[PDB]
Symmetry: D2
Subunit: 317 residues, 4 copies
């Protein structure tokens, strides 16, 4: 029996609404927009429903406040969060969003425990780890969207320097989705050409590369300070959809995301940004980049950053 | 010389941002997001830029507050308006938005007078007429988005009754974008089958048809009541993109929109919702539907309702 | 468990290869190209495989001569046929292609009896009926591609007259895929406007309409006489894919195709061209067009044509 | 003035027809299918025209034998060649195809001298050089399709070893389109990970890499041996479309193709397979890969192999 693909979006704010919009536009799946706030998901679902005929999609998009409606969901995308943008650090939402995810975990565990779960809620890496422990879902079926967003920014900034199509830039950001984030310059290439060659050719300087690395790391504030009323939401939505595509279409796509890293990068069992292979069984493998001694040290510092915020959460009131 | 297609979006609020997102996603054109509000268009443009590599698009999307940047725009889409949603009627925003469109008119006249202009700002039909007068652009290069949204809603509700793909429903809403809009039930077909045949076959009643007609006319309120923060914006954005597509691709597509009707539907020279043919020369034609006497009268009421609001604008302080 | 969608293409000639190409391009499913001819499916599958990375699709396309490889197929598309184009009538291939379908029926019945089967092999309507009887598959899970091709031609010719987008022309061809084919002029509309109105407006004559009807009926020879080495294959392939999409995505799409018509159009249980609704359960409903007395008579003549060729087959050597 | 994009396809055989099909499907441009063979281009154009409404495209596709019809073409793609496949080497077709391209050269020079020309006719690199000389078009507006096909094969085979999405493999083939082609294994990465790292990790051996390199170079024979009626045509068609896209959309895309290399890879002014940047001005740049000494030598052999065949053409009867 052919059953329609089904994606549950938990939290129908800025990011949640865009996800439903894009999923519906692509006819990737039916969408269930869940929110505790009255009217909002229903209003967005009705609005998006009207656009479906315009896009030529037969996707159904509905709004709900009832976890029963997410039963049979193939993918669950968690965007739920307490109000207000972070001032200086994504960790400011730690305590509130952890409690939200406790509730979301009970909903998923009861109504769709076989779903592939993509966490978006900040602070991403710690939230992903929290959700996995509380929900009890397999490690390979729970991950966090971050790397795709960070790497896309990294790739975009490199592409903007050289004036080329960003799709032809290969570039990875790894580690935690925070200031300790590691854009791995060593394995950057533009159509096969490494950055070291472009330096010799006089087309880019090491200082320009450092500026691009810094830009990647602080990119979230650049967007947030301009929007004023919140953080980025167009690209993070698109990124979550790319991850859902990889699972639903069994792409074996290489996806940088927050995944349970057990026998790679010198860590013994932690959720952090790593290049994964995603397919019909969720996170199916992790790829090991060729890191320089400096990059290994920077990754080490990112890991400490993650563990620090995680311990703070473990000692929450 | 091959040149990139360019779409200027005047007003980077709810609808404007979504237009930029979708246009970018489809790689239909480069986008210039214009707004007077500080930060907003810049923030959205940067966020949407980060998503382009995720979508595999090379569209550039920039934010600005300078009309010089809309220079050489192939299409201009106007979403600019005063804040706050309408409580009962779209006409409450009349005088404020008229002042705004004067600024846009002088901007377009100076920097891109050959552009195809699609107005979205409410009250739609009067705003379109106003923009054409002040800007001095050809009647065929200036129209308003409404019919696509209204017809899409009409098609969606018919499709939901019969349980079929809305894309296989043909249906038009004509007249002004307001309570007086005419969902032409005589124009309706589902896979070639007219509503009269469905009544005879006992697959729909006249009461159900009346309900669908009513639903269409007040659909905006159903969305707005649930959103709380404002009016519909996912579907209106998509509708504008469909109209921009018809122009940029020279589709010769049937597009219900607010266009200068000079010798059809028993009017002499007025902007109202009619089925047009849109291609590379803007509004290239208007189709004459086979309206019943009741529908002709309903359309007459709509025309007067439009003329009423238009005269009030002519008698300004 | 997410399993990839799988389409089996039985016969890897002109049409079969294009189907695999388009399915792969769209990433609609994995494709199995089956043929008894050595090398051909394998060569086409390898060639098409190389194009997948270019299209950004992860679809797997393989060639085979083994029916075991079509097990678990969601859709089976039958293109298998004896060599050579028909001279004057599609019925010339009757006896040979019936025997091929006996063999194909055994393959499907054994390895994928729950598949949605779309027959393409000519003479279409009789071949569809033959396959259903020999295979023993449910009537709603076996249909023939024809109406989509015939209607697309009908729509295209109307659209070419008016100089508009063919997607905005609603037009149906019903009955058997042969000379008795019935393009139903009565229910043609262009953006809501019926042909009767265009006649009054002086934009089309009844003689031009008759020419378009004739063109639709003899369209196959116009293509075949130009190609010389065979019959049409680009559009029939595309048409089969549209039908596969409707099933796999549960579109509830209105699809004119050869379906088992039991309580409609005055027939008591025959495969002929009718507007169907297709979804995850195959042919889920049949729509009844509003036919004129003349059109009812023409349909009657088409039905006789179908029954005549069917009786000939029943008395085969 | 908005004008439709126009692509002329010179030669409506296996590849030419597929190009028209895909270009139409994507609504990338209008297509003119040119051929001297009677009926063929007309038959394919009509067949493909019928599919346009199925794809929701408004692209026009016409067939012709008159060069006046390629007037105003933005892109010209040359597939014209003498019949019969190569047995061992692509160079067997040298003199025949050279005569053909003289006709095409004079046609393009007369009717669309500002066109971007993509040659496909074998022997590719020599034919490209020949067409440029005879036609007198700028070096940057004339290139050949080969690298995209060779690189796509290379990427596909690497991806199949690692079991990942080929789109996430970066890999280049450079030099002439023949046995001397250089799959640059030093350029290869899979999600940022180079082959050297995969060897160290025990996920691939050097022998397996050597096999992949060999597979790439003789991939054309594997397809041709299985097709029997001719050489590959699904993937070569798709490759040409990707190149046309880069030009028409001004992508600034990294495209390995046969381009006029004047001051890179240690050559003075020759057409050979190199990574280019393609945008609205044709070949806008050439990237310099970080080749090993072995790869530099292999490339040197390829350059001579190309020069050999080129000199034979210069010494015609
Ligand atoms: N991982 C990343 O790269 C990344 C990028 C950007 C934003 N984010 C994060 O994503 C989250 C969402 O961002 P946003 O802009 O959509 O926020 P938002 O405030 O617009 O939306 C949050 C929504 O969650 C809902 N909600 C609150 N409590 C809930 C509960 N218990 N159950 C269900 N829903 C609940 C709210 O009603 C609201 O609609 C934030 O935590 C943000 O920091 C992450
Ligand atoms: N035609 C339809 O069917 C339809 C449907 C929905 C909404 N609308 C209308 O579309 C308009 C926009 O809706 P929205 O939700 O995007 O509103 P919004 O408030 O989110 O956006 C309006 C934007 O216009 C900007 N603006 C204000 N003054 C300006 C000026 N002088 N120049 C340039 N920009 C200026 C604001 O900064 C704001 O960003 C409204 O008038 C609404 O009623 C029409
Ligand atoms: N329904 C329609 O609208 C429509 C339109 C066009 C063509 N057609 C029909 O579709 C059929 C295929 O057309 P085509 O151009 O692809 O023909 P083709 O000759 O190019 O391909 C037929 C293929 O079937 C294979 N074949 C033969 N016997 C077989 C068997 N027992 N099992 C499996 N495969 C076998 C052959 O090897 C060949 O590759 C023809 O009957 C044609 O008349 C139908
Ligand atoms: N670059 C690559 O990687 C690559 C890959 C595959 C094939 N090819 C080459 O592409 C070419 C075409 O392949 P195909 O399979 O389409 O061949 P084909 O024989 O199917 O098509 C060639 C067409 O050219 C036409 N033609 C002959 N003389 C002509 C003239 N003077 N003007 C215009 N048209 C003329 C023929 O009528 C025929 O339709 C071949 O040379 C082949 O070797 C190149």
């Amino acid at each position: 029996m052919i059953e329609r693909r089904k994606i549950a979006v938990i939290g129908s704010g800025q990011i949640g609404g865009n996800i439903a919009y894009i999923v519906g536009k692509d006819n990737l799946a039916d969408v269930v927009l869940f929110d505790i706030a009255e009217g909002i998901p229903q209003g967005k679902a009705l609005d998006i429903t009207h656009s479906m005929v315009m896009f030529g999609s037969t996707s159904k998009v509905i709004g709900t406040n009832d976890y029963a409606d997410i039963s049979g969901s193939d993918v669950v995308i968690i965007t739920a969060s307490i109000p207000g943008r972070p001032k200086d650090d994504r960790s400011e939402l730690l305590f509130g969003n952890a409690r939200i995810l406790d509730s979301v975990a009970e909903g998923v565990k009861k109504y769709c425990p076989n779903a592939f779960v993509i966490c978006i809620t900040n602070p991403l890496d710690v939230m992903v780890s929290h959700f996995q422990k509380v929900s009890g879902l397999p490690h390979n079926k729970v991950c966090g969207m971050a790397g795709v967003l960070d790497s896309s920014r990294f790739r975009t900034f490199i592409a903007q320097h050289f004036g080329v199509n960003a799709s032809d830039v290969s570039a990875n950001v790894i580690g935690g989705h925070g200031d300790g984030m590691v854009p791995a310059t060593s394995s950057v290439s533009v159509g096969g050409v490494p950055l070291s060659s472009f330096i010799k050719q006089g087309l880019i300087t090491q200082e320009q590369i450092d500026e691009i690395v810094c830009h990647t790391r602080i990119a979230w504030k650049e967007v947030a300070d301009n929007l004023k009323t919140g953080t980025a939401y167009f690209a993070p939505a698109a990124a979550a959809v790319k991850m859902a595509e990889a699972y639903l279409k069994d792409k074996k796509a290489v996806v940088p995301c927050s995944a349970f890293c057990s026998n790679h990068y010198g860590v013994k069992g932690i959720y952090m940004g790593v290049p994964t292979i995603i397919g019909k069984n969720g996170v199916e493998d992790i790829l090991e980049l060729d890191l320089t001694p400096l990059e290994q040290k920077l990754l080490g510092e990112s890991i400490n950053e993650v563990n620090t915020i995680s311990k703070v959460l473990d000692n929450a009131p």
